[PDB]
Amino acid sequence: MQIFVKTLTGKTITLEVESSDTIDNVKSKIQDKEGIPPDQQRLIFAGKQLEDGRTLSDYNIQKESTLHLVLRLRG
Amino acid sequence: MALKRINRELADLGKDPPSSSSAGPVGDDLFHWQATIMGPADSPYAGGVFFLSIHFPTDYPFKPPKVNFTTRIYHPNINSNGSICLDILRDQWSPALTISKVLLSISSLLTDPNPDDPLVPEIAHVYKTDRSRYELSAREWTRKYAI
Amino acid sequence: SHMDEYQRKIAYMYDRPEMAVNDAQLQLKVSRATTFEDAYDIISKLSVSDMKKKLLIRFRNEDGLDYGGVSREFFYILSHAIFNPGYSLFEYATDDNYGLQISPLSSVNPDFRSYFRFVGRVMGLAIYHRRYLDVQFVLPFYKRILQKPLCLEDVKDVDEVYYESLKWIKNNDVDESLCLNFSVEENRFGESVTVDLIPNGRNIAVNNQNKMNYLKALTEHKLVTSTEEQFNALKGGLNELIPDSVLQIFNENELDTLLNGKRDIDVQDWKRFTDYRSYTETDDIVIWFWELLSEWSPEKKAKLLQFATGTSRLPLSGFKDMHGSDGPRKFTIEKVGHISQLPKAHTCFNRLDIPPYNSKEELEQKLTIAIQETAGF
């Protein structure tokens, strides 16, 4: 299936993925497209931060969902 | 560059607001904004309304704005006075960051505190050890102050 | 060896026939309270021949021997007075990273040229008589004094975040979303005014072809064009004594060492102007910390200071007038974390979190390891 990842700079990257793909694989794809190290990726979907070790299906990610790549505020 | 950009950002916010956060100049001063953030639904702060003060430096968009919470919030990573400074290193702010992305990041922080960087040691310790007490105290403070 | 080469250069400079002090002595009396006023009244009228004689400085109503110490104290006081941001001649590059630079607003004075010529005379007199100031300018200042070209990288020493943003613009592409154009908004006494980098510059957006010229103009305006007349007067005053052919054998670092001497961080001031959270002044992990800092070399002390506070540069008045991101914030030591974890640092609050170790050796090892990734001086 297809999903859309919107970054900080207002750019939108479209990815071809499957619901069983791991979060790590998606961050890897974003690193391949944008050059952002996985350690620095903060992905948000519907107000919840995606965590390594789980799958997209765990978060009910379906056809043409939209994710956010958001700043990591410290305090 | 420091005023045309601000006007464009304000127009965009008035165009398609995130439907939760709001921002607008106070009186007539485009370099001083007041913003409103609604408490995320899936967090102890649900129902609250938190006010932020945003000061744009004259070097904007090259230097990040100063964002400070005004309403008191019981959070592991927000000091008593309130200060949301953006620092993994000096390598994350770029002229391409609008003010909406910062508000979205603040909401993300509200809905997912980071306990490994304890700015308030007691609250961080409570969060690590006993989560239920942290939730109860956070919602109590939201009821007392945010409302 | 940097030190050997620098010593050779210093000996050659002071061995020139055009930098020889006369045998006659000059008496220069100044009151301690009104140091700046009397210094400006006297120095600003000395002739070039007079300024080249031996300098004998006396403080009024303070009779004492060892005039060398008196002269050193006088130069310290004068340097901390004239270069003080409160006097509206110089200013920190940023409030959280204290780097002195000529203040663009200083032009508001009826005649800033006399004051800046006096500053140049003071610097030239300090260099001429082998006396040291104690201020710490930004590298572009010394590069301008030596007449070197200024490039984008030089903005790193002035302000880090501005340099990072400029580098981002240089690397990545620029769209019309970024309302960037050839003009800069500067706030002068409340009111903000627009300065055009190029004629009709406020109505020219930056494309992917103009961004290089835009970066060039921004760098030049930030580093040079804003303070042309003032620095020209200052350098004229400086070259009044030290010919330009003598300054141009050093570089931006050897000249800094020549002016301010070998930089070092005071530890007594550090200890006297620090505060503790959950720690008492007599706790073991504080007395051990201060002993370790006492028996440390300046490079490692600067590295620790950068790791904790954020920058290795200190205010003009030590740790007393220390500013955080949001305002004044004295260096703080707090008890936070487990024994195994390394000490942590909150930069925007000048906080250092030292867990409660059990012996001085463990504290030293952890503290030396925690600062390796940070480079200071």
Numbering used by the authors:
A (entry chain B): 1 to 75
B (entry chain A): 1 to 147
C (entry chain C): 292 to 668
What does the literature reporting this entry say, word for word?
Transthiolation reactions are central to Ub and Ubl conjugation pathways because they are used for transfer of thioester-activated Ub or Ubl from E1 to all E2 proteins, and from some E2 proteins to specialized E3 proteins. Here we isolate mimics of transient transthiolation intermediates for E1–Ub(T)–E2 and E2–Ub(T)–E3HECT complexes (where T denotes Ub in a thioester or Ub undergoing transthiolation) using a chemical strategy with native enzymes and near-native Ub to capture and visualize a continuum of structures determined by single-particle cryo-electron microscopy. The resulting E2–Ub vinyl thioether adduct was combined with Uba1 (E1) or Pub2HECT (a homologue of the NEDD4 family of E3HECT enzymes) to yield atomically tailored dithioacetal analogues of E1–Ub(T)–E2 and E2–Ub(T)–E3HECT transthiolation intermediates with substitution of the Ub(T) C-terminal Gly76 oxyanion by a cyanomethyl group.
To determine structural features that underlie directionality in this process, E2–Ub(T)–E3HECT was vitrified and analysed using single-particle cryo-EM to yield a reconstruction with an overall resolution of 3.1 Å. Three-dimensional variability analysis was used to isolate 7 reconstructions with overall resolutions ranging from 3.2 to 3.5 Å. The cyanomethyl group of the linker, which replaces the negatively charged oxygen of the tetrahedral transthiolation intermediate, is positioned proximal to the Arg74 side-chain guanidinium of Ub(T) in state 1. The predominant Ub conformation observed in reconstructions of E2–Ub(T)–E3HECT shows Ub(T) densities proximal to the crossover helix of E2. This Ub(T) conformation is evident in several reconstructions, but only state 1 shows unambiguous densities for the Ub C-terminal tail. Further, this configuration for E2–Ub(T) differs from prior structures of HECT or RING E3s with E2~Ub(T) mimics because it shows Ub(T) C-terminal amino acids within a hydrophobic groove formed by remodelling E2 amino acid residues 86–92 to create interactions between E2, Ub(T) and E3HECT that are unique to this complex. In state 1, the Ub(T) Arg74 side chain guanidinium interacts with Asp117 of E2, the carbonyl oxygen of E3HECT Ala636, and the cyanomethyl group of our linker, a surrogate for the tetrahedral intermediate oxyanion of Ub(T) Gly76.
